[PDB]
Design a protein around this ligand. Structure first.
Ligand SMILES: [Zn+2]
Ligand SMILES: [Zn+2]
Lengths: 94, 107, 66, 145, 93
RNA sequence: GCCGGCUAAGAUCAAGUGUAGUAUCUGUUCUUAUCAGUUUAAUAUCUGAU
């Protein structure tokens, strides 16, 4: 039903040698926090992020939709220590 | 132990702006004389009201801030300063002493 | 000494307000030039005369209960 | 040199960061284009957190560089970025972002941030108009004459 | 959070500030457009008090100034602008 | 807020949580009464008698 005003941002093209603190720091550049139950979500690996490193995708949430839109319009193809990464709204993944 | 509301209102030479609560001060004649200024501005209407001028009519029903046409009617080069600094409208509000009352806009 | 001398507070008497009024209104008379060369033209007195008069009036002007 | 000096500004060194701020500023001094808009926006977003450092030299260099950065990038883009950044970066370093908006008022004409920030008050949010007022405070406090 | 000041006879001693408290004015507490330099009294630079910050109360790294919004208001013409109160007195930790 | 009223108009006691600071939440009572004093711009409040 709902089409626009999405708070789910999908970051692709992340190196498998990345951690969760770096993802939190990158998400803080465009947001504040999404630690509703305990904390915010992260990348979903093969064995629930236990055995594998990362399945080339990470999820990020924000309090408002304008912040997510600004991040997607500004953090597009952001260069992290391993490579450049792209940002999308849905991308047909989660 | 003080002048009544009539004795303190007749002895003064300008009872047109006399107040009932003002007659119980420490110097009623001094307050009456000071209130007789040429074009001063008296105390606001929230002197005795205990509603803070915001709790009574707490249900405000109006836009927050309508965009003025003095500036709304690269961002703009030959029309930005030519519409805000050129086609600007002067804000016509109160002049000297229209102290904001509780409502002050609905009545 | 110099904490707040020049003005009273919440229950300042009218006389004690006018006393400070005159006591700080003459200092703008003994010090300022236009308001001192203008009073010596009306009273027709010298600068020293009017200044000494204003200084002696600072004892308890406005009508003193002394 | 721009992408090479970009990670250098992220260092925590006092003198190193102080020199890198002036270097990034002078990089956009004469010609000043020499960049993609996204790179300049990212550099500004990174430097916005250093506008209230302990050392006053870094605080002065950040303001000296952000003026040229905003003059080279553009009024509307920088204004929209600063406005979107108001909700993020909760009130421990948020006010510095407002100062950045004032930098735009110090970097561009008054009608570069006035009409854009005016539409930010039409939103009925409480701590949106509150932030707009807190930003206009520093704007009129640093806009000068 | 109402800070107190010395407010004594402003001598011929210049002001100072710490590495972190050097920008803001000793009274206005703002970093915007410093106008004039702050001063101190005779009991503000005496032995151990030599070269101390007027806000941080420690080491001096610069000269204490006033804000342009605090010097135009004639606030600098008051006494010693040293930030000292009952808690921030001489016998303080 | 709705078509003068439906007790969401005020003051106040006990406890919890938390801050540098402001605070936030739960449970009461509200004199339905009179006089004298204190006091309040006036209420209120408190101090005593009935
Ligand atoms: Zn200091
Ligand atoms: Zn001192």
């Amino acid at each position: 039903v709902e089409e626009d005003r999405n708070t789910n941002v999908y970051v692709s093209g992340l190196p498998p040698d990345i951690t969760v603190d770096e993802f939190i720091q990158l998400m803080s550049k465009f947001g504040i926090i999404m630690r509703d139950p305990q904390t915010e979500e992260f990348k979903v690996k093969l064995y629930k992020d236990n055995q594998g490193n990362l399945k080339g995708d990470g999820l990020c949430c924000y309090l408002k939709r304008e912040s997510v839109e600004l991040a997607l319009k500004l953090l597009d193809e952001d260069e992290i220590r391993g490579y450049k990464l792209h940002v999308e709204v849905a991308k047909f993944q989660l | 132990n003080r002048f009544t509301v009539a004795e303190l209102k007749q002895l003064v030479a300008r009872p047109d702006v006399v107040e009932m609560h003002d007659v119980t001060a420490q110097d009623p004649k001094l307050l009456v004389h000071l209130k007789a200024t040429r074009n001063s501005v008296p105390v606001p209407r929230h002197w005795c009201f205990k509603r803070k001028y915001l709790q009574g009519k707490r249900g405000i029903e109006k836009p927050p801030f309508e965009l003025p046409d003095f500036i709304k009617r690269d961002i703009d080069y030959q029309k930005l300063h030519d519409a805000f600094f050129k086609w600007q409208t002067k804000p016509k509000l109160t002049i000297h002493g229209d102290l904001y009352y509780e409502g002050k806009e609905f009545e | 000494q110099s904490k707040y001398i020049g003005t009273g507070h919440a229950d300042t008497t009218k006389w004690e307000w006018l006393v400070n009024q005159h006591r700080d209104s003459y200092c703008s008379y003994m010090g300022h030039f236009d308001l001192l060369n203008y009073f010596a033209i009306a009273e027709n007195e010298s600068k020293a005369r009017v200044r000494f008069n204003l200084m002696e009036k600072m004892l308890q002007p406005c009508g003193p209960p002394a | 040199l721009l992408p090479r000096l970009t990670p250098i500004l992220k260092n925590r060194h006092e003198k190193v960061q102080e020199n890198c701020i002036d270097l990034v500023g002078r990089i956009a001094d004469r010609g000043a284009e020499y960049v993609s808009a996204r790179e300049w926006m990212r550099i500004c977003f990174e430097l916005l957190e250093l506008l209230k450092a302990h050392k006053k030299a870094i605080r002065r260099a950040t303001v000296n560089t952000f003026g040229y950065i905003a003059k080279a990038i553009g009024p509307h883009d920088v204004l929209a970025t600063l406005l979107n950044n108001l909700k993020v970066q909760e009130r421990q370093n948020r006010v510095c972002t407002t100062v950045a908006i004032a930098i735009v008022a110090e970097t561009c004409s008054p009608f570069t941030v006035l009409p854009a920030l005016m539409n930010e008050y039409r939103v009925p949010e409480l701590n949106v108009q509150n932030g707009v007022l807190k930003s206009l405070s520093f704007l009129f406090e640093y806009i000068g004459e | 959070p109402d800070l107190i000041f010395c407010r004594k006879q402003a001598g011929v001693a210049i002001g100072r500030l710490c590495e972190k408290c050097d920008g803001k004015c000793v009274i206005c507490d703002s970093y915007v457009r410093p106008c004039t330099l702050v001063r101190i009294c005779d009991e503000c630079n005496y032995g151990s008090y030599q070269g101390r910050c007027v806000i941080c109360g420690g080491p001096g790294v610069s000269d204490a100034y006033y804000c342009k919004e605090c010097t135009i208001q004639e606030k600098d013409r008051d006494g010693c602008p040293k930030i000292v109160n009952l808690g921030s007195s001489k016998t303080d930790l």
